[PDB]
Amino acid sequence: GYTVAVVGATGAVGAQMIKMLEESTLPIDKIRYLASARSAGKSLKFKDQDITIEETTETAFEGVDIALFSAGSSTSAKYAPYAVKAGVVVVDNTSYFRQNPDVPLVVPEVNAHALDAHNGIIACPNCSTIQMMVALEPVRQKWGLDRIIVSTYQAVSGAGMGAILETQRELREVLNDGVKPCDLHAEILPSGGDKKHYPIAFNALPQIDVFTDNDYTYEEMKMTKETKKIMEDDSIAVSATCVRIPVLSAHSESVYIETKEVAPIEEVKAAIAAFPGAVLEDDVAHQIYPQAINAVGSRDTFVGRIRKDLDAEKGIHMWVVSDNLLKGAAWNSVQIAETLHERGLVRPTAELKFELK
């Protein structure tokens, strides 16, 4: 089978990428771990095999059949076009190539068909978008979607290994040393690139990624724009509010929709339940609903609290939870890689459509 490279092997997503590949249906002959200079030379396991980490360079992709990128937009912007030139099929986790019409933006259970026409890079959508698409696609299939209003409850792991560590030490300082939450010193959250940083311990930060010109943040607009693209329908109205909360792993979403035809609630539960990747967890009589802590370690997307709006005939509320590192990232990526292998789509692209620097 394949030589498979993981770019960003030492990170939060990369650790999970390693785990998803170890259990993958993909024929792997050789596995390669790529990071920056700081991890080069260091060792990391694949099953029992002992794998030395390689520095990522323009010439690192010779002999590689598939590369999963999860090292940040800059790394992908820099080294993915070279991997393509080399003959790799790239599955990128970052947001860099997502809006490029030459690049499929794929959730396998929803739009696997878009993989066929790939040009050597396939993008794994934003994590909050992925779980929402899993939850919503069986609903659109039957009754259509007019609009989505979403408020998200995002875990810190989506911002990376340092974010996780920053949160754990902040909480430890409050709970163990008696420090007040607003006397904490943050270096990373709400966004690593932005000017100011704020404590997350016992907080809810209504900022993920930086702000755009319309006063929505980038995370908020990614949900809007990625939704329209994955679902292939620009007429679906989408607005989002994305909040960081003190959760390590698993994103949660309060999702409001309006359908095009009225959609009886028990039929909505049945539709979601019967969609691949989606698990109905909805039994309010035994207080059953999706929970972040129960979603961690699972590849499934969990859906509950499903109930019609109190006023809008065609309006429905729900609660959607998934592990942001698995379905939101690594599992979706490994699922994409497996689907490409299955459909004969793991080969070089003759025509190069991504400029180099």
Ligand X SMILES: NC(=O)c1ccc[n+]([C@@H]2O[C@H](COP(=O)([O-])OP(=O)(O)OC[C@H]3O[C@@H](n4cnc5c(N)ncnc54)[C@H](OP(=O)(O)O)[C@@H]3O)[C@@H](O)[C@H]2O)c1
Q: Are 5 and 34 in contact (CB under 8 A)?
A: yes
H helix or E strand, kind and range, residue 188 = none
**Count of residues in contact with ligand X, rule CB under 6 A:** 30
Strands 66-69 and 2-7: parallel
Is 125 within any annotated ligand binding site?
A: yes
Beta bridge partners of 35: 55
Using rule CB under 6 A, residue 12 touches ligand X:
yes
- 289 contact choice in ligand AS2, ligand X, a copy of itself, none (CB below 5 to 8 Å, kind-dependent): a copy of itself
Closest CA to 93 of 65, 127, 53, 131: 127
Catalytic residue among 118, 242, 251, 341: 251
Query: Which residue from 4, 127, 303, 326 is in contact with ligand AS2, where contact means CB under 6 A?
Result: 127
Is 242 within any annotated ligand binding site?
A: no
- 13 contact choice in a copy of itself, ligand AS2, ligand X, none (CB below 5 to 8 Å, kind-dependent): ligand X
Is 11 within any annotated ligand binding site?
A: yes
- 224 contact choice in ligand AS2, a copy of itself, ligand X, none (CB below 5 to 8 Å, kind-dependent): a copy of itself
Shortest Å, Cβ 47 to ligand AS2: 27
Residue 25 burial (C-beta neighbours within 10 Å; 0-12, 13-18, 19+): exposed
Using rule CB under 8 A, residue 114 touches a copy of itself:
no
Q: Considering only residues 36-55, where is the footprint of ligand X by CB under 6 A? A: 36, 38-39
Using rule CB under 6 A, residue 154 touches ligand AS2:
yes
Whole-angstrom distance, CA of residue 224 vs CA of residue 205: 20
Using rule CB under 8 A, residue 44 touches a copy of itself:
yes
Q: At how many degrees (to 10) do helices 331-342 and 12-22 cross?
A: 40
Strands 121-123 and 145-154: unpaired
3-state secondary structure 95-117: CCCCCCCCCCECCHHHHHHHHCC
Measured over all CA atoms, what is the biggest interatomic distance in the chain, rounded to whole angstroms?
61
- Of the candidate spans 66-74, 122-130, 313-321, 327-335, the one that interacts with a copy of itself by CB under 8 A turns out to be 313-321
The residue (of 72 and 138) whose beta carbon lies closer to ligand X is 72
Q: Are 64 and 91 in contact (CB under 8 A)?
A: no
Closest CA to 89 of 115, 111, 114, 70: 115
Residue 329 DSSP class: I
- 160 contact choice in a copy of itself, ligand AS2, ligand X, none (CB below 5 to 8 Å, kind-dependent): ligand X
The residue (of 25 and 45) whose beta carbon lies closer to a copy of itself is 45
Is 12 within any annotated ligand binding site?
A: yes
Residue 177 burial (C-beta neighbours within 10 Å; 0-12, 13-18, 19+): exposed
Q: Considering only residues 72-131, where is the footprint of ligand X by CB under 6 A? A: 72-73, 75, 93-95, 127
Query: Which residue from 64, 67, 90, 159 is in contact with ligand AS2, where contact means CB under 6 A?
Result: 159
- 208 contact choice in a copy of itself, ligand AS2, ligand X, none (CB below 5 to 8 Å, kind-dependent): ligand AS2
CA distances (Å), 2 to each of 63, 64, 84, 311, 334, in order?
A: 9, 7, 16, 54, 13
Catalytic residue IDs: 127, 251
Q: Please give the residue ranges that form the binding site for ligand X (CB under 6 A).
A: 8-14, 35-36, 38-39, 56, 70-73, 75, 93-95, 127, 157-158, 160-162, 324-325, 328-329
Binding-site positions read 10-13, 36, 38-39, 70, 93, 98, 125, 127, 154, 157-158, 161-162, 244, 324
Q: Please give the residue ranges that form the binding site for ligand AS2 (CB under 6 A).
A: 126-128, 154, 158-159, 208, 219, 324, 328
